[PDB]
């Protein structure tokens, strides 16, 4: 099957040469989630890659979201 996409929850502004800026709502592909705190991602709006805080992204779909979110997603699908 295809990639599981993630979405930026919050705006994040890159401060160094290692991180990347993302804007809330932008989708990303996860490249390296082998650290808990910082994840390497590909921006699906710029094509750039770099690290963002793991807590600033969440899966777009799937099954780990709280029950009310799963129910609302199903209702509007």
Q: Give the contacts of 60 (CB within 8 A, at least 6 positions apart).
A: 4, 5, 6, 7, 27
Residue pair 39/57 in contact by the 8 Å Cβ criterion: yes
Residue pair 3/60 in contact by the 8 Å Cβ criterion: no
3-state secondary structure 1-68: CCCCCEEECCCECCCCCCECCECCCCEEEEEECCCCCEEEEEECCCCCEEEEEHHHEEECCCCCCCHH
- Tell me the structure's resolution in angstroms, rounded to a single decimal: 1.4
Q: Where are the domains of the chain?
A: 1-77
Fold of 1-77: SH3 type barrels. (2.30.30)
Q: 77 has which bridge partners?
A: none
């Amino acid at each position: 099957g295809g990639v599981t996409l993630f979405v930026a929850l919050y705006d994040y502004e890159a401060r160094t040469e290692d991180d990347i800026s993302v804007h809330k709502g932008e989708k990303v592909q996860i490249l390296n989630s082998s650290e808990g705190d910082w994840w390497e991602v590909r921006s699906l709006t710029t094509g750039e890659t770099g690290y963002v805080p793991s807590n600033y992204v969440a899966p777009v779909d799937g099954s780990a979201a709280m029950g009310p979110v799963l129910r609302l997603r199903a209702f509007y699908n």
